[PDB]
Amino acid sequence: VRLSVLIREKHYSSGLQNVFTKLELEEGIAVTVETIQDDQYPTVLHARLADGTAPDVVEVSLPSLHALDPYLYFVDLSKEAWIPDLLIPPTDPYGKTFALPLNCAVSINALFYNKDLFDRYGISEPKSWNELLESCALIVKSIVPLALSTTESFPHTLLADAITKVLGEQGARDLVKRATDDSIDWTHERALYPVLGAYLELFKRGYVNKHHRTARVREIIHDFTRDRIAMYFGSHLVADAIIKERPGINLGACVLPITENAQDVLTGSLEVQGLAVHKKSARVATACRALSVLASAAYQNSFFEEHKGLPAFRNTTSAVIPACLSALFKSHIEKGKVIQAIDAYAQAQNTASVFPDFAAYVTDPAPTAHTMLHRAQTEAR
Numbered sequence: 001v002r003l004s005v006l007i008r009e010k011h012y013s014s015g016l017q018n019v020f021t022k023l024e025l026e027e028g029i030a031v032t033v034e035t036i037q038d039d040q041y042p043t044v045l046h047a048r049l050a051d052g053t054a055p056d057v058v059e060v061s062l063p064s065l066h067a068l069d070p071y072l073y074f075v076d077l078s079k080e081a082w083i084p085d086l087l088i089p090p091t092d093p094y095g096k097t098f099a100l101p102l103n104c105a106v107s108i109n110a111l112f113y114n115k116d117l118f119d120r121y122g123i124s125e126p127k128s129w130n131e132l133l134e135s136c137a138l139i140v141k142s143i144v145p146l147a148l149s150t151t152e153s154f155p156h157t158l159l160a161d162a163i164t165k166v167l168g169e170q171g172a173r174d175l176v177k178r179a180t181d182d183s184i185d186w187t188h189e190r191a192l193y194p195v196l197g198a199y200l201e202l203f204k205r206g207y208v209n210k211h212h213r214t215a216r217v218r219e220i221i222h223d224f225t226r227d228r229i230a231m232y233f234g235s236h237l238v239a240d241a242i243i244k245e246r247p248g249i250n251l252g253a254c255v256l257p258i259t260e261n262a263q264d265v266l267t268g269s270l271e272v273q274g275l276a277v278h279k280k281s282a283r284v285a286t287a288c289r290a291l292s293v294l295a296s297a298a299y300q301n302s303f304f305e306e307h308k309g310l311p312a313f314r315n316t317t318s319a320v321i322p323a324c325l326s327a328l329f330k331s332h333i334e335k336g337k338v339i340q341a342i343d344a345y346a347q348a349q350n351t352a353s354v355f356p357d358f359a360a361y362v363t364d365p366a367p368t369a370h371t372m373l374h375r376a377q378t379e380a381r
């Protein structure tokens with residue numbers, strides 16, 4: 001058979017090339033690839049879908065699909081036999097999967113800590129909010145307690161994680177929605193009262209430093225590898241970078257206990273790439289057959305000898321999981337217990353974010369969470 005593919009220039013890796021080469025060699029599917037310059041790809045894909053000339057398989061950005069209507073353009077893959085093998089199945093707002101993902105996640109947020117420092121000062125892995133506060137207290141008795149690094153989005157990762165967890169997958173999506181269409185009224189967001197309270201308490205006790213929050217990732221790495229930071233909350237990509245810089249460092253990773261339900265789910269970025277099937281294709285069956293082969297352990301294993309990042313599927317031997325993420329990989333990631341943090345969405349980025357810079361409201365004397373919500377709403381109007 002034949003299959004046509006549309007992909008981003010910079011995403012047409014040796015990984016995918018060899019994947020498509022195997023497909024032609026072993027499965028008798030002649031694949032023709034059409035690459036588009038990355039900054040142009042969303043424009044081009046939209047146009048080709050609109051005029052119906054789009055290739056059989058197209059690269060898409062998960063989870064939001066460039067705001068395209070998948071029920072118009074893409075095959076619903078939710079019932080394909082390989083869906084159970086996904087670690088974190090991509091979903092639209094109805095829970096349906098419209099692409100084969102190349103990774104389960106871009107970024108996982110966790111509390112990373114220096115196991116040796118914890119041992120030195122008799123600190124145990126915090127398994128609750130009070131244990132976190134106590135852990136910070138002992139560090140101050142003995143080194144910045146809880147370090148944070150700067151981002152290009154609001155709210156900061158720490159508050160984003162906590163808000164996302166209390167609201168859950170639907171609630172978090174709705175929050176981005178109403179923030180983005182400007183219908184939100186922050187004084188109605190009383191579900192956020194306790195997590196803003198927690199945030200405030202960290203500032204109050206000096207466990208997080210407002211003046212340090214603009215610290216670059218490079219600075220966190222520099223200080224962490226010199227035993228100047230006990231705990232860092234943020235992206236596992238930062239933890240990876242710490243280990244790269246100091247291979248012998250003894251790093252642990254656990255849930256940040258900042259909400260009553262923190263142990264239930266991890267947050268992160270699920271803004272991964274995927275391959276969707278063009279609904280109006282005359283070769284939909286062939287496309288679906290191809291994705292099924294691509295999803296197979298043999299192909300995933302070959303792919304991840306080249307492709308970087310976290311695996312998309314269960315039992316991808318060639319995908320390396322960082323040792324520090326080992327526990328969380330088994331407890332949460334492998335079980336799909338991950339949802340997208342509200343700061344990971346494009347709308348959240350300053351380019352002007354749809355979310356408030358809540359930390360900017362925290363001055364001396366500190367306001368209440370009620371006052372922070374009023375301030376957020378005042379800036380809205």
Ligand SMILES: [Br-]
Pocket residue numbers: 154155156159356357358359360
């Ligand atoms: Br914030």
Ligand SMILES: [Cl-]
Pocket residue numbers: 074075076279
């Ligand atoms: Cl369909």
Ligand SMILES: [Cl-]
Pocket residue numbers: 216217218219
């Ligand atoms: Cl940096």
